[PDB]
Design a protein around this ligand. Structure first.
Ligand SMILES: Nc1ncnc2c1ncn2[C@@H]1O[C@H](CSCC[C@H](N)C(=O)O)[C@@H](O)[C@H]1O
Lengths: 235, 254, 122, 144
């Protein structure tokens, strides 16, 4: 079945005229947009955002820590990652592949946050205790619907309706710039796009360790904030 | 507004003690993490322990490592254990070396009953933790005009503000060609209720009752009325000194 | 280092890709507003200017063959060769090579035809 | 009136394409219909409901895996119009019978018988579809 009209002759050509002026309309709008961007217009990403766009395996963290020492002198303070987990119906995100990356080299004094689903909760614990980190606390986010209901997440053994994140500690976390018992470890917010995360957790972290460089891992264009050295394949 | 009516919908279903008979079995030994439990039941399904960790304290974490669970006690079954935030960690790893595999978790989010009564207006007695929850329950749509996140707990904690409690639930498969019967999706992993700030780790009735109802629904076949069988296929530890729930083989530590 | 802005610029220069941040430039919001996959670095625009120098407006169908821009797309490339000329239609430059612009001055005088947004209507 | 009740917003030409595809392939082989590609923009569920309307019987359990004539089944369903044919569909009296009973039912029934201007897309891809749409229209006028 052809989507277009079978035969209309010039009777369709008149409609063609309509369409073609529509065509010019778009491009002229485009020109305006061009003049709007090539004049010094400021986008949504704020200052002090450092989006390293590179594969985490390809990236050499040694250069990163060298720059850290050269410019600031203190290595990382707060770290996060929400890596692509395993579903069993890329494949190099094997939890072991996530493990062997030397995050322990990237951190000596500060916290960590790792969001993960309950189906990979336990492997997250071994993910965090393996390093000098000690699992101490958890921040959990309860999904919300448009009205204020609870999302009907798929149930394997119970109806999954919340998401979890683990916290760890190595070295000394009382570096002065850290704040304790900042606020509650729960976040109630709507269910945004696929595996998206609440932007208020960055407000939480700003309450936690302000005036210091951060490090989220596996970001998107949404994640970028101020004071956030950030990494991500799609970033 | 808040849609909080649906949040506490199952709490409107209250449904709140069998004597020693073919329906209820009773054990009261001064030791439990040392007493063999396979003699109290075999091939059982539901196995609950009310481990009130607290960092005063009720039970010491390092004690749990000395308890023995044999395959003769249960081939296919589940253990349920409590978790406390000030003692978080050092509990998530003890049980795996006893021979279970992690499957899921359950959790209770406490919505700060004092803040709920404050929003209704605009140390707590047993009455203030039993009837006041009904009081905030029946007028549940008057505070729905407020924000949910406001009324949460603000309890002292080293890293954040402690708000919620947790039920670790662990299933073991031990016998090939044998499985278990489950209802699965009965009660949402998210549930909602208030809890006193004096003992947030502790859970009183109408909430303990909620957990009891959900576990009774998840594992119905584990129960046995006195006529059908005398031996019970599901046992319990650290219950109340006066409650002897039917179906459960209660083991209260005196 | 509490000099957050200078620190950020230094890290961008040290680590960030060239198409992300300039040699000693700001965040370069132009790459942010456009999507990942199609952006117009100075390299891409100078390559398209080279393509214009190759044959100019006309029956020049090798726009994508040369791959002057990064993963050249025929419609996007033909769209982005138009603001330089400043005129919506290119029929008055068909079949000839164009070296420099010399078109903004001869057309901005046409106030009625169009002068806003650095462009003329038809 | 309203013979072979129509789903909202589908052409009758699509209906006859579906009839031909079901006559050639068979009921229940929706994956083969997608493989042929004669019905673009159609899902397996929606084509299933459309088959429900076209057969004249809402329950397709008795018609699974049958290369039967759709119009013949619809006509014989009017032959039994004494039952309430809601949306020109007969509700099967059998409540989801066992696979054996459904299989013998299968045996007995066998024995008896603009577009891209939408989507809120940006200028690039809409123009990408537009220019070759106009090329298609120009060729159509050339052959006319
Ligand atoms: N190995 C990989 N394969 C594919 N996409 C990857 C990836 N690593 C990172 N990404 C990108 O980053 C995402 C993983 S992280 C997703 C959540 C995001 N970090 C947040 O907090 O909002 C992917 O959806 C993709 O956009």
């Amino acid at each position: 079945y052809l989507d277009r009209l079978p035969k209309s002759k010039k009777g369709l050509q008149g409609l063609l005229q309509d369409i073609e002026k529509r065509i010019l309309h778009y491009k002229q709008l485009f020109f305006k947009e061009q003049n709007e961007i090539a004049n010094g217009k400021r986008s949504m990403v704020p200052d002090n955002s450092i989006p390293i766009c590179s594969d985490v395996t390809k990236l050499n963290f040694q250069a990163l820590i060298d720059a850290q020492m050269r410019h600031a002198g203190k290595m990382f303070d707060v770290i996060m990652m929400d890596p692509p987990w395993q579903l069993s119906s890329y494949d190099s995100l094997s939890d072991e592949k996530i493990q062997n990356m030397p995050i322990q080299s990237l951190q000596q004094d500060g916290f960590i946050f790792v969001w993960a689903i309950n189906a990979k909760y336990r492997v997250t614990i071994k993910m965090i205790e393996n390093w000098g980190y000690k699992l101490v606390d958890e921040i959990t986010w309860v999904k919300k619907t448009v009205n204020g209901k609870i999302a009907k997440g798929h149930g394997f053994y119970l109806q999954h309706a919340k998401e979890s994140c683990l916290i760890g500690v190595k070295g000394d976390v009382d570096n002065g710039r850290f704040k304790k018992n900042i606020a509650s470890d729960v976040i109630f917010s709507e269910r945004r796009g696929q595996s998206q995360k609440p932007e208020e957790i960055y407000q939480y972290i700003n309450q936690l360790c302000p005036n210091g460089n951060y490090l989220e891992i596996f970001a998107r264009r949404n994640n970028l904030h101020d004071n956030w050295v950030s990494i991500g394949n799609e970033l | 507004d808040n849609q909080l009516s649906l949040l506490l919908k199952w709490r409107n279903d209250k449904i709140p003690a069998s004597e020693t008979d073919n329906k209820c079995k009773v054990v009261n030994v001064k030791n439990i993490f040392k007493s063999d439990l396979s003699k109290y039941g075999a091939n059982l399904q539901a196995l609950f322990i009310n481990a009130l960790w607290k960092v005063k304290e009720g039970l010491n974490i390092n004690d749990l490592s000395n308890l023995k669970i044999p395959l003769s006690l249960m081939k296919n079954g589940i253990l349920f254990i409590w978790s406390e935030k000030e003692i978080l960690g050092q509990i998530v790893e003890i049980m795996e070396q006893k021979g279970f595999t992690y499957i899921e978790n359950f959790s209770i989010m406490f919505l700060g009953l004092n803040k709920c009564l404050q929003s209704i207006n605009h140390e707590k007695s047993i009455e203030q933790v039993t009837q006041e929850k009904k009081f905030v329950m029946n007028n549940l749509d008057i505070l729905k005009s407020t924000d949910i996140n406001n009324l949460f707990l603000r309890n002292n904690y080293p890293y954040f503000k402690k708000t919620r409690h947790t039920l670790l639930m662990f299933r073991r498969i031990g016998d090939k060609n044998q499985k278990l019967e489950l209802r699965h999706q009965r009660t949402s992993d998210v549930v909602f209720e208030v809890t006193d700030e004096q003992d947030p780790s502790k859970v009183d009735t109408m909430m303990k009752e909620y957990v009891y109802q959900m576990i009774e629904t998840l594992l119905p076949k584990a129960q046995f009325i006195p006529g059908v069988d005398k031996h019970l296929k599901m046992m319990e530890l650290f219950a109340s000194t006066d409650n002897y729930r039917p179906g459960w083989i209660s083991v209260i530590e005196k | 280092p509490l000099d957050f802005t200078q620190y950020a610029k230094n890290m961008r220069k040290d680590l960030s890709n060239q198409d992300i941040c300039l040699e000693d430039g700001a965040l370069n919001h132009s790459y942010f507003l456009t999507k990942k996959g199609q952006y117009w670095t100075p390299l891409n625009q100078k390559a398209l200017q080279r393509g214009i120098e190759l044959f100019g407006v006309g029956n020049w169908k090798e726009i994508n063959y040369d791959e002057f821009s990064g993963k050249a797309n025929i419609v996007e490339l033909e769209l982005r060769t138009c603001m330089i000329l400043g005129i919506n239609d290119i029929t008055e430059y068909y079949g000839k090579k164009i070296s420099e612009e010399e078109q903004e001055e001869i057309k901005k005088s046409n106030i009625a035809k169009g002068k806003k947004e650095n462009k003329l209507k038809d | 009136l309203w013979n072979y009740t129509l789903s909202p917003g589908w052409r009758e030409e699509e209906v006859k394409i579906l009839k031909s595809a079901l006559q050639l392939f068979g009921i229940g082989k929706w994956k083969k219909i997608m493989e042929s590609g004669c019905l673009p923009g159609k899902s397996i569920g929606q084509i299933y409901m459309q088959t429900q309307r076209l057969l004249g019987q809402q329950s397709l359990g008795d018609f699974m895996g049958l290369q039967i004539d759709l119009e013949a089944v619809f006509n014989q369903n009017m032959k039994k119009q004494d039952v309430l044919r809601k949306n020109n569909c007969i509700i099967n009296t059998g409540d989801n019978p066992t696979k054996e009973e459904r299989k013998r039912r299968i045996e007995q029934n066998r024995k008896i018988y603009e577009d891209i201007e939408n989507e809120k897309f940006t200028n690039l891809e809409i123009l990408t579809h537009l220019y070759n749409l106009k090329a298609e229209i120009v060729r159509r006028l050339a052959e006319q």
